[model samples]
Target: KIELTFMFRGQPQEQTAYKNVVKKFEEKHPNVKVNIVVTSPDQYATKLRAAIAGRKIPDVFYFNPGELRAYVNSNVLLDITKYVENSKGVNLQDIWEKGVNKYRFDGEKVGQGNLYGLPKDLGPFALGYNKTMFEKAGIPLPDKDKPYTWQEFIDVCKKLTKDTNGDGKLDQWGTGLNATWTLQGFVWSNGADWIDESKTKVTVDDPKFIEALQFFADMQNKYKVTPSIAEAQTLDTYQRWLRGQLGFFPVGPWDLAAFDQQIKFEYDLIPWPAGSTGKPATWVGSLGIGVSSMTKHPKEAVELALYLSADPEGQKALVDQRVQLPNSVKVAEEWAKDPSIKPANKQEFLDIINDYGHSFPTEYTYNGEWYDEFYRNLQPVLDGKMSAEEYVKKAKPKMQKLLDQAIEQEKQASK
Candidate 1:
């Protein structure tokens, strides 16, 4: 039998789902035997890097969105554009345009390059609130269709922050989110970003960006609705939410499985509050599967990647788990309409993907040092140790240097 190795990161549920997919594929193609290797996400990158350097890379592997540029620069990712183009059974139009394009890389830019990977799923962020908490507080439930304005959202948070028990100790929080992880939505909603569209310049110093940054920090330090970093360390935010102590929590489809089992309160997803531009902002995240250029089994690897990403049966396996939103538009529509799903507002995720999703800037010009440096500097801002202006001003020069380095690397890769 022809043997191939596929590498990925997985937890209990996804691991089971992937194994089932592999089993079905192996049953259909009996001659091909697949070996599945699982790794923890924290260690996957280091292991993959070591594998590549040792020239022992798997035939097929999970594609990380953050490492897209680095992999392209190394010339180790197989270009699957032609394979996709010639495949009749897989209709590219049925897939979300942006979902497929997120993996496109031309060496100089992303979103308009040769396809390198196929998306495993589209992860759109949304606000998941405790319906029970709102009812107890006698507050109007947030509308999934209508988003609250910035001030309105802050007011809601204020109302939600209260001591539920007569003991006078604050047990319930208005919201809980990691400022570092979820800041992109606020910045994007305010019509500001750390970089311009071309990914060639740093714009974190813009007033609009600073404004959003301040508002995010103030939610903790000034408004005192969300937990401060210190408070979160005592009891992790996600754990607190699971215990029904958090009024609002940042959520993606991956949380649905866990939330359904652990959360006792009535809950549903909602659109993020509109910012200065009166528009909702959200970050789109996804996993992509791709073939390694170093693989000896190119044809088989391509088939496996295609099976995992594009095949109806494969997508169906992932969709049924409710762990990921399907990349296929048609399947997503049906999935959203399914009443069996716990959250009645499942359609909100579909709306976000179809209307308001923006890929994170790092997805295109991802430089780990550059990206990490930006967040590192922002820690002081989040902690009230520094002003947003001061943080951005100091961060801009360092950020631009890294962006320039990434751009030059991309230009070199193109040649």
Candidate 2:
């Protein structure tokens, strides 16, 4: 039997039902012996770097689309264009077209055109709200099918956050924007974007842009409905929500299962609040498989990678596990239709994908710097560390510096 290996990071399912999955795949292949290598999420990048540098990387492995830049820089991934072209049986077309761009580099020709990786799962964002908190506030529960406007959203958050325990301190937070990425929804939803289209520059100091950042920060200092930065920094937004301290939180679909297991109190996803754009917006992230160029058996490795990503059974297994949102269009629709898998925020999840979803900067190489400064400059405004004017003035220069750095890096990398 040919020895094959698969690597995953922080996937709890791998210890349980996934063992059977591996067994089934091996049984079907008959001549293939699959060995699973578990890796910690925190150490994935470091271990992967060491493997690549030593010319001893795993044959099949999991990777985040956002980190593709680092791997590509190392030039250690196998080109799988042919596998994709010949994958007629695997339903390559079943993957979302917008999402496919995430797997590609700057080029776009197909085989060596620009694409390299295969998508494994989807992770669209949604705003989850506490049902019990809404009921007590005398505010009608928001229809998951239809989310509120930005103004109404603020009002709802305000109504729900109260020092209900009568300890003279706020026991409930109106909303969660503890992280920079989470605030993307509010900024982008208003037709204000965090960066330029070229993805090589920052535009966070724009008027509309600065306003959105201020709005989110005001939730704490002005609205007095949300937790302080110190409180939020101690516990992630998700944990705060589970503890029932946060009434509303913007989170990815992946949180559904974790929330279900930890919090018995009812919660549901709501549509992103509307803004001048009159639309909802959320950042997107996905997981995919990439074959290592250093592997001795490239063909065998690619096949296994494809199985984890392109296989229908494999795709369905991920959705059932709720490890992430399914990337397969058909699988996504099927999962959406299944009421049993629905979190408290059922309709919110569907609406974002089917309507309000925005792809995170997949085609750009400057994503890291752009996303970093987005919060860096905005945080001051949110924390009341700087006024809107001062925040914009300070952020503009820093953002431009990063933009210049990213553009220079992109140019040098290609050359």
Q: Which candidate wins on TM-score? A: 1
**lDDT tens digits by residue: candidate 2, 278-381:** 77788666666888767777767767777667677766665566566767777677766767765744555656666777766533553366556655456666
Q: Residue 400 error for model 1, in Å?
A: 1.5
Encode model 1's per-residue lDDT on 1-415: one tens digit a residue: 6999999887566777788888888987798899998887667878888888887888888867877777877877888888787765878678888788878878666788798888877889888999999999999999888889989988999998888897987888888778766888889989998789876788989899999999989988888887667778898888999999989898888777667677899999898888887888888788788888877777777788878888888778777775677878888888789888768999989888878877777776755567768987677788788998899999989988888888787677656
Which residue pairs in model 1 clash with each other? Answer: none
Best by lDDT: 1
Weakest lDDT window of 10 consecutive positions for candidate 2: 106-115
Candidate 2 Cα errors over 4 Å, as ranges: 1-7, 11-56, 66-74, 85-88, 105-115, 233-235, 344-347, 373-380
Q: Where does the lowest 10-residue lDDT sum fall in candidate 1?
A: 363-372
